[PDB]
């Protein structure tokens, strides 16, 4: 079975799809392994920390190119595999058969799209069907996601997950609480975790998504203090320079799709912590 | 069918009397069975004819009777072998007309002077004269063996023909002729080159056709090589610059093509007074083709030049056109120029070169097409013999240094790829203080791609200055990143010495390199871990035995215990490849 997932794996380099058949069989195991980690899972330095893909295969391509091969290098990213871009089937599927194979060298969170009802609006859900000619696929997927880690904790200093905060979350036991086995909420705390966005206006305000909250940098700070955190690591909005601090670098956002859509003419970015915690960014352009 | 002849035949086959290949080749012994008289009468005959479409047969037989000449039974009977011949000279697939051809031309020699008279020539005219037409394209190639040895009747005769053939009325017949005019034209009496050659000559230069033109001019280049220095202006200059003149990019293509060749047939005073211009206005052409096939001969054609007109038509004349083609758009042309334009170097002196070579150099160094600047890159032999190696790294260093380090990783990427060009060209000496220092600088690069780049890159240069020049100046600084605290680079350590291991041999790898690698074995990251399991199963064949079960076998062995999964199944692995497990 290991001689098989390398296959596999070499196979979803090329671009190449795998069948309906190993889907399923990937899918299963990679819950398994998924069941056993926490809501705020433990990772462990050194390891490159990645925002969102959202299908871009031959940008993710170029973002291993630019940080190293896996399993060689560690790696963890913070969710949003799928929808805008035009291969969320092989980008996916390359990770979780990364995440199967190598579970100690990658780790996958869930973002606000690791979900069922904007996959069916974004992408994800019409690409599989166009692959696979019947709705399988996405069942199999979208219900791996429901085992995908809201958060992890690198190091006990660097907090990481793919939105941002929650007036209905103040410490890293109220998410430890939660039970993230389900699809995502509409409100709340899990809801919110993989919706909200830093913003430049005080305390709590109203994302204009429609879901989650905008939190100012005194959120920010009181939330660092009472959790012993050094900084906020997340994802989810566009940030043209690739990534972006913010809160007196009490939060980073980390963006690695460049050219989002193919239309936005950004730079990508991901986070090198090396043996020290130490970071340093590397910015990016789209691959030729 | 009878024996021994029925012994070519092929009685398994399908076919109309094919002949087995395997024997056709065999044929000398078949001649030698049956006699000289009997080879002439019955083997002969039997080949004339039976001529099958089995091609791969058809070629051995015209090259095999070009060596028949005394199985037949010397010179008085060498004729015979022409029948047969003239049959495969108008056969189909060229490949056998032109043996039969060049086959004829060797059977030439051994008829005697009157046996050509009496028998060749005649088969040269029929050819000639004959219907169908391979039967004319092949007969032109039989005039220059048999002209020199007939009569001076026969030769008038001869020439005739050779006219009829270039004024013929098809196309293919008239290139043919056109493209064996100069080998003609070699070997007839001054006189008749200028009393027949020349109309001829003339004729084909203006031609309908500019397919028949463009192979005048190489006819050009041999005609006007027989004629005396003063003849050539009102014989043939005319129609030389008319040439490179003509309507036809085709037919000015072939002139910027065989250029250096004309300069020589024409000589020194005649290039500097017409083909000075010519080249200039060839180097202007509209058409990029031409541009190209000029810029080409650049160097080639100033080396040629008259000794003392020389260095001033080039500042004056050439120099000013090049400045011009070193910022043309077409990159066919650009790309023609920079593989020869650093050439020029000796040609005008550490002080010229430096002063306006180099300039252009830098110009060329820093083009976008790729290509460009690895034509000039490809050449700093020369440049480098003629100023110093000190003014040239004065030149060179900074457009390399500011690559070496540039925005986009690719861009730097393509400058760790003119790395061992330049480590051949310009010297180990040289490599060893200037250049060391930035392929050491990208194994720590940021960017993943460059490291590895920069990583392979060492076995190439180790392939250019050998395992002890790696030993001293390589290995020692590869090996201190293993105290790095980044596992990026810790890792790299152990990428270098994979790489290193194949082209260092058994010695320094078991003495120098396999001991940092087993010191990695308990290093605080997993992933440092199981790369040294690889690096082991990589590096582990070059390793005498002894040393692989004494200190390999052990380490795995305690890796295989490792807390860590990865590191469990890479020291497994790296056992059961290695035979120690
Ligand atoms: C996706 C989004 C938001 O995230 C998006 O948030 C805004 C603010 C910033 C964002 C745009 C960012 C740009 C950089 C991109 C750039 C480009 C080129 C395109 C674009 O792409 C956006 C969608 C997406 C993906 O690419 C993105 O989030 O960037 C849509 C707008 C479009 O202009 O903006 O827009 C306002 C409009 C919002 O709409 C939808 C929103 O209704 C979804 C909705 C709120 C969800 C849908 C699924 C079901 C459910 O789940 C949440 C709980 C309730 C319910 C179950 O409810
Ligand atoms: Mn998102
Ligand atoms: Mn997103």
Redesign the interface.
């Given at each position: 079975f290991?001689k098989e997932l390398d296959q596999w794996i070499e196979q979803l380099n090329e671009c190449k799809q795998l069948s309906e058949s190993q889907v399923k069989s990937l899918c299963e195991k990679a819950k398994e392994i998924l069941t056993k980690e926490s809501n705020v899972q433990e990772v462990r330095c050194?390891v490159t920390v990645c925002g969102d893909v959202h299908g871009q295969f031959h940008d993710l391509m170029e973002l291993?190119?630019?940080?190293?091969?896996s399993?060689?290098?560690?790696y963890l990213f913070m969710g949003d595999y799928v929808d805008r871009g035009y291969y969320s089937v092989e980008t996916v599927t390359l990770l979780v058969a990364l995440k199967v194979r190598?579970?100690?060298?990658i780790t996958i969170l869930r973002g606000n799209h690791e979900s069922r009802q904007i996959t069916q609006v974004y992408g994800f859900y019409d690409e599989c069907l166009r692959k696979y000619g019947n709705a399988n696929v996405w069942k199999y997927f979208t219900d791996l996601f429901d085992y995908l880690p809201l958060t992890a904790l690198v190091d006990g200093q660097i907090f990481c997950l793919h939105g941002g905060l929650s007036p209905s979350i103040d410490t890293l036991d109220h998410i430890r609480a939660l039970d993230r086995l389900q699809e995502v909420p509409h409100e709340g705390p899990m809801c919110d975790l993989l919706w909200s966005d830093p913003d430049d206006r005080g305390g709590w305000g109203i994302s204009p998504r429609g879901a989650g909250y905008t939190f100012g940098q005194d959120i920010s700070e009181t939330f660092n203090h009472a959790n012993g955190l050094t900084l906020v690591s997340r994802a989810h909005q566009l940030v043209m320079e690739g990534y972006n601090w913010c809160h007196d670098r009490n939060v980073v956002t980390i963006f690695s799709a460049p050219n989002y859509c193919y239309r936005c003419g950004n730079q990508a970015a991901i986070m090198?912590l090396?043996?020290?915690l130490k970071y340093?960014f590397?910015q990016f352009?789209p691959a030729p | 069918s009878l024996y021994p002849i029925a012994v070519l035949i092929d009685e398994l086959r399908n076919e109309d009397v094919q002949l087995r290949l395997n024997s056709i080749k065999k044929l000398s012994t078949i001649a030698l069975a049956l006699g000289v008289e009997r080879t002439r009468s019955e083997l002969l005959p039997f080949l004339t004819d039976t001529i099958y479409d089995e091609d791969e047969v058809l070629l051995a037989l015209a090259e095999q009777l070009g060596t028949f000449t005394t199985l037949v039974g010397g010179p008085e009977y060498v004729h015979c072998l022409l029948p047969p011949l003239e049959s495969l000279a108008t056969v189909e697939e060229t490949v056998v007309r032109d043996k039969a051809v060049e086959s004829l031309r060797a059977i030439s020699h051994e008829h005697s002077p009157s046996d050509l008279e009496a028998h060749f020539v005649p088969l040269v005219k029929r050819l000639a004269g004959g219907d169908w037409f391979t039967s004319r394209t092949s007969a032109c190639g039989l005039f220059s063996v048999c002209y020199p040895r007939v009569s001076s009747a026969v030769k008038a005769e001869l020439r005739q023909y050779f006219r009829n053939l270039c004024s013929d009325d098809t196309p293919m017949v008239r290139r043919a002729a056109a493209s064996k005019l100069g080998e003609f034209a070699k070997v007839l009496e001054l006189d008749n080159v200028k009393s027949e050659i020349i109309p001829m000559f003339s004729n084909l230069a203006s031609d309908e056709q500019d397919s028949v033109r463009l192979l005048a001019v190489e006819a050009c280049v041999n005609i006007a090589q027989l004629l005396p220095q003063e003849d050539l202006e009102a014989l043939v200059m005319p129609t030389l610059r008319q040439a490179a003149e003509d309507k036809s990019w085709r037919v000015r293509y072939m002139v910027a093509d065989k250029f250096t060749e004309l300069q020589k047939a024409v000589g020194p005073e005649i290039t500097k007074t017409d083909l000075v211009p010519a080249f200039q206005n060839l180097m202007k052409d509209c058409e990029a083709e031409v541009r190209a096939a000029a810029s080409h001969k650049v160097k080639e054609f100033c080396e040629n030049l008259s000794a003392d007109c020389r260095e001033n038509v080039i500042m004056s004349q050439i120099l000013p056109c090049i400045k011009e083609l070193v910022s043309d758009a077409n990159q066919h042309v650009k790309s023609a120029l920079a593989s020869v334009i650093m050439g020029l170097s000796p040609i005008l002196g550490k002080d010229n070169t430096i002063e306006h070579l180099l300039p252009l150099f830098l110009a060329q160094l820093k083009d976008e097409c790729p290509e460009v600047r690895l034509n000039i890159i490809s050449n700093l032999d020369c440049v480098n013999e003629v100023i110093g190696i000190r003014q040239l790294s004065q030149s060179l260093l900074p457009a390399i240094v500011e690559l070496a380090e540039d925005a986009?990783?690719r861009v730097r990427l393509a400058i760790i790829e003119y790395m061992p060009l330049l480590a051949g060209q310009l010297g180990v000496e040289f490599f060893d203080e200037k250049l060391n220092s930035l392929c050491m600088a990208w194994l720590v690069d940021?960017?993943?791609?460059i490291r590895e780049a920069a990583t392979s890159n060492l076995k190439k240069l180790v392939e250019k200055f050998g395992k002890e020049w790696a030993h001293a100046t390589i290995i020692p600084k590869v090996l201190a990143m293993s105290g790095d605290?980044?596992?990026?680079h810790r890792?790299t350590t152990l990428f270098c010495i994979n790489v290193l291991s194949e082209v260092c041999g058994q010695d320094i790898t078991t003495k120098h390199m396999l001991p940092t690698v087993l010191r990695m074995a308990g290093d605080?990251?997993?992933?440092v871990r199981?790369?040294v399991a690889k690096s082991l199963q990589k590096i582990g064949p070059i390793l005498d035995n002894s040393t692989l079960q004494s200190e390999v076998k052990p380490i795995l062995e305690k890796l295989t215990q490792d807390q860590?999964?990865?590191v469990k199944?890479f020291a497994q692995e790296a056992l059961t490849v290695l035979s120690l497990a």
């Open positions: 290991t050194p291993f190119r630019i940080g190293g091969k399993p060689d290098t560690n190598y579970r100690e060298r090198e090396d043996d020290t340093s590397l352009d | 986009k990783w940021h960017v993943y791609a605290p980044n596992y990026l890792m605080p990251v997993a992933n199981f790369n860590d999964v990865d199944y």
